[PDB]
Amino acid sequence: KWTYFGPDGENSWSKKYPSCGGLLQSPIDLHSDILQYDASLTPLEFQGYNLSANKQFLLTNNGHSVKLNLPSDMHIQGLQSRYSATQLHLHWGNPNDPHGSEHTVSGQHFAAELHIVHYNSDLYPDASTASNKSEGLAVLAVLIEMGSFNPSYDKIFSHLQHVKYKGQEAFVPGFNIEELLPERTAEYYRYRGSLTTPPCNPTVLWTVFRNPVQISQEQLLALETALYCTHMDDPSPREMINNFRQVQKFDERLVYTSFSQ
Ligand SMILES: Cc1cc(C)nc(Sc2c(F)c(F)c(S(N)(=O)=O)c(F)c2F)n1
Numbered sequence: 001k002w003t004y005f006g007p008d009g010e011n012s013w014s015k016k017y018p019s020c021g022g023l024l025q026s027p028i029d030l031h032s033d034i035l036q037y038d039a040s041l042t043p044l045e046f047q048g049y050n051l052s053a054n055k056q057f058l059l060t061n062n063g064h065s066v067k068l069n070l071p072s073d074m075h076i077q078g079l080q081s082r083y084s085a086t087q088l089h090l091h092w093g094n095p096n097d098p099h100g101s102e103h104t105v106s107g108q109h110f111a112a113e114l115h116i117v118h119y120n121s122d123l124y125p126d127a128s129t130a131s132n133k134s135e136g137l138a139v140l141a142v143l144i145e146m147g148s149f150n151p152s153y154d155k156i157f158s159h160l161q162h163v164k165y166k167g168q169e170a171f172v173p174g175f176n177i178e179e180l181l182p183e184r185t186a187e188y189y190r191y192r193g194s195l196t197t198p199p200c201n202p203t204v205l206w207t208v209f210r211n212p213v214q215i216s217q218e219q220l221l222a223l224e225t226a227l228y229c230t231h232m233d234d235p236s237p238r239e240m241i242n243n244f245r246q247v248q249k250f251d252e253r254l255v256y257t258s259f260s261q
């Protein structure tokens with residue numbers, strides 16, 4: 001069992017999941033000392049991200065986040081191999097300190113973070129197999145700040161009061177997942193790291209977009225207050241808050257940027 005708070009929290013993940021104490025761990029603070037421009041980093045292309053509106057996709061509260069299942073025909077092109085999507089989900093803080101992204105930029109958290117998980121489908125039959133191979137996974141990260149309402153993020157958030165408890169599910173009509181991405185997607189940070197949850201496998205090629213998107217005050221507060229880690233009618237609920245990992249050491253290494261500074 002793992003959590004973000006108390007005896008099963010992140011300083012204890014290495015007891016059940018040894019890779020959480022291993023090398024290449026994410027997330028990290030993206031700061032000047034550790035950045036270098038790499039002009040060979042080209043734009044990713046996002047294929048099949050305009051999901052059919054006549055199809056539904058499963059939204060689930062899994063006890064650790066809210067996750068939307070994504071289809072195999074969605075992928076990114078541009079890496080050595082094609083990577084196919086498997087799911088997206090979010091990380092956030094809480095209303096008294098609404099700074100719960102995973103990655104930080106020059107020490108600042110953002111309000112929340114979206115992850116769109118993909119696996120190397122040219123070399124591996126599924127995401128479980130890929131998850132133990134170097135560069136087996138590729139995750140896209142979008143930093144989220146509070147400001148303007150976001151109609152495209154609302155296609156997910158409008159369902160939150162109906163997946164309040166662990167194990168609950170909703171169906172979301174397809175919509176264009178590219179509208180969750182920020183401006184200037186050609187500008188990003190790129191590095192080799194790990195899953196930021198157990199089992200913390202060091203097998204993720206990260207792409208964190210440079211620019212954040214905005215969601216409203218009301219949307220961020222729904223995300224921070226609607227959900228629980230526990231089942232309905234568990235007599236001692238646990239609020240799903242602060243489900244982000246602290247930044248990790250990152251020494252002797254570099255994050256590559258597709259933008260110059
Ligand atoms: C290790 C493994 C195997 C499989 C099949 N899916 C997953 S899904 C997943 C994942 F791949 C991720 F990269 C992450 S994250 N926070 O984006 O690092 C995650 F939370 C996840 F839930 N992870």
Ligand SMILES: [Zn+2]
Nearest residue numbers: 089091115196
């Ligand atoms: Zn994540």
